[PDB]
Design a protein around this nucleic acid. Sequence first.
RNA 1: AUUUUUGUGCCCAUCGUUGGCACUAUUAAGGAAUGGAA
Length: 1057
Amino acid sequence: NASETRKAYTTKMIPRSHDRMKLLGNFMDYLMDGTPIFFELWNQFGGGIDRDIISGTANKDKISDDLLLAVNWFKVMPINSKPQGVSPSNLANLFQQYSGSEPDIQAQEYFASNFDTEKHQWKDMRVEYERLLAELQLSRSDMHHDLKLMYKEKCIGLSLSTAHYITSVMFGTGAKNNRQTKHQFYSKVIQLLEESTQINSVEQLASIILKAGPSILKIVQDYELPSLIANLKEKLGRFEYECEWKCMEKIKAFLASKVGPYYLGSYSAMLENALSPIKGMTTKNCKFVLKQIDAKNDIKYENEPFGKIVEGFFDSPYFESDTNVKWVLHPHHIGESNIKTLWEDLNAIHSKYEEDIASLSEDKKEKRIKVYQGDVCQTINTYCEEVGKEAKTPLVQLLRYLYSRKDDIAVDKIIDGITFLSKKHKVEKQKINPVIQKYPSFNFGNNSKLLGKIISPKDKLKHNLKCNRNQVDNYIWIEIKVLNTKTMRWEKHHYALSSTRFLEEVYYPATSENPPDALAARFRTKTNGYEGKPALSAEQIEQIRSAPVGLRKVKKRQMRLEAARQQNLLPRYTWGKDFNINICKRGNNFEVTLATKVKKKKEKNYKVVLGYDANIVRKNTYAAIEAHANGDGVIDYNDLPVKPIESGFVTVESQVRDKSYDQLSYNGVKLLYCKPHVESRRSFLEKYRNGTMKDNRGNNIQIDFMKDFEAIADDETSLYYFNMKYCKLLQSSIRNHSSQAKEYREEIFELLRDGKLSVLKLSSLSNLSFVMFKVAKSLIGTYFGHLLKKPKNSKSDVKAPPITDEDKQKADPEMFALRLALEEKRLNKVKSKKEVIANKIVAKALELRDKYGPVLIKGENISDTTKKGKKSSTNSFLMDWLARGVANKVKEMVMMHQGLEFVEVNPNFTSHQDPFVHKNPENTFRARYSRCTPSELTEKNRKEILSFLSDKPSKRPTNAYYNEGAMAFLATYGLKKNDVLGVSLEKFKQIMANILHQRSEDQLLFPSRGGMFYLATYKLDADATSVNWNGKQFWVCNADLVAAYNVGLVDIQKDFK
RNA sequence: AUUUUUGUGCCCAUCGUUGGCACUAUUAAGGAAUGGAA
């Protein structure tokens, strides 16, 4: 009914007096050893659950009652823990022994679920419970009664209450003798004499009954047909009928010895930090096991042979590599269902060789088999490329071992085996959520939490005037209560930290009167709408320019903040006790994290829908569609009316010498200014130009590495692209020379570390760039394997391993170190793309809201949504980290502003969809065309068209739109298939132009597999040109832009009623 | 309650002209793809 999202604010604990700091240090220290016992004990508290205790409880999201008990009786911890371990057999009988019922089918999976046999084992919590009543020696029924109550206040099982609340019921209600009516009603009885008024028909006595409505029915006819001496007796008896915690006191006292004197703030803080894992794990593992068998059950589990033989290629001759690392097989390999088509062709020519083999079937020439051999690969090679051309690329080497057993297994079975393999292989390898208390951290909320409060901005300049200090200091201050161990008292103290980002965001204060009003978002973000670009003043420039390089960057963000406040450009920020301080201490370092909660009623009635495509493979594109559109351009979608407001590529330009440098678009500088570095890398190759390759057909061919390198080294080419392609080339050359595996030691470092334009030095955000790193990692890893091996091959029990990495780094720590560093930047480099894409998506999303209204962001991601029923595997995995991360980030970001909503959506194969044309009212598919000059048209393109039009039947409904385009091709220019055949490309481009000169046109286009040009019914591209394709008017625009709109269209109607 | 030298990151043939940017925290596991064009 309301959005509740709080933003975190990281800060640098600012060291103070060594002694002062130490006081906090211990306080922190004591707490740590304090909450751990609660975690070990509350464990036991959950280890005594009773079937009767849960009786009538229910309120479980479709959760087997028996199953729930299983997670509290005992869980999985570490091998060496306080509680006693258990066996993966008696386990099933224990539940039956404890509950008098063979374990349900939901709790049976939990026990079956895998876990670290190496470092973990299940531990009986019920035993520790019996053990719990051992030392405490509390009465079984006593404890059980007390316990039973705990479950009523959700202090056990699931949906537990606030830590403080649980600490205000167990060790709360501080009153020596002050209960519901202890010193109030009891004193009233003696007060009757004090006032000496006849205690008959007192109006106040009636009001409880009168305000609240046998005995009670006899009070309504009290004197209508003054007894009040029966009410007292009844009250005493009614008060004696009620009961409260009895076993609690022994428990409280026990803690004291270990935990220490009890305080709500601590006794409650220590518990919250301790019980976080317990509650989480239970909820988590429970959710996990709930859906664990969800697919596992109905999920086909019978084609093991298919999967078993499918992988046989991993252990087949086909699988050859250095790292010897087996990767999970998937449907995407083999073009999935697509590969079905190609089998026929293979067998068709296979039979032929078998037939041609009959006619010349003699030991005279075995070259036929070798030639039939090479021919095959080529087909696969084209087939893998072709299919990958517009959809990744299936493994061609894996297809070699897949055909090997042609008669072995069937084609359909293989596809069925791949799907089965896909789930079981990994889906089943999801291990069990173990429960272990990790580093804790207590915060200081305004109220109903640990005593605490951050220096007020109104009392910051008011208390600074008393000390006569600079009206403002770039340092945040805060004060909270704490416990001095030595004195065991409740004292207070002041400490401050400087989160620069937080100063500008919402801490720095605007002194000037009539300053700008705060934004709804309440944060000084440029996205929120504060450029924060104040005119850098005279002294400020001196302040920046003259400062040291190190802090030089921070001071700049420092001087701009003060100038904005000086020029009154600093918008006012509303302030409240809405900040929670989170303090965590590691070593002598304390990681303080402050964040506030944000709430905003959801904008359910949206009039603008924005869909984005964060595709790692293709360029990112943003599209916004107006909902309930009314205007000159309107399209009725399924009796729903809208128009496309705008469509554009997501670009992140970076100010550099007055030149926009897109982080996702850049791919390196021109090889013209990269001549010196290029020459050195080129000089390296000459020594090792000798290498062995493999013919497209399959016969390995030996070639000079340089020739490929030369084509690679051109001024027009980019340094980034060449840098990857170099490693790929560098990979292979060193491969041909495993002997000199330590001879490429220097070059590598230069190439990715000390090198002038090292991959580490310069790193773009373009898809190709991340490519360098992955390819980068392979090369270094590829170096060790060839570098680390025994001279003799296939000996001493099939060679040996690469001594992990732990003992494999000893060979070259620097090298190993580089990889860590290389990875290190990649992860941060990966984060950047995610956070950055969100800002731009949000912004344009936000921009639209301001001009049109509340808008929805349609995103392609598979959320942990309810897909119970029918799910599609093709759409199962079509989004990588970028797609996921962005969507999740956006969904996280959307929490900040009003009128913004984020909806996840199963990824689809929308690559040839038509704007406001698909599923409206019927489905309309088209082909991917590409425009280009007649001057440069390769044979590949010339033969590409032939592929589609080739008279070949295909039951599978795929590539049918391509043929129509081809036909459309001919008819469009009014030509004939045979009017052009085997005319190379010299007489092929000559024909168009005459046909192009007659229509006075240029750069003709055609349907290309995975092109950048598409024919759309509507103008989805502002620069899109209008043209009639085969007598049909269409809007020429970039396919990427069209894709964005398609994503937005998917199930748009479901979110409008 | 005075520290006044820093919250975390990203981009670049010219690490600076005030170069140009973006971000919610711990934690958890895992983390399969030889493509460049203002």
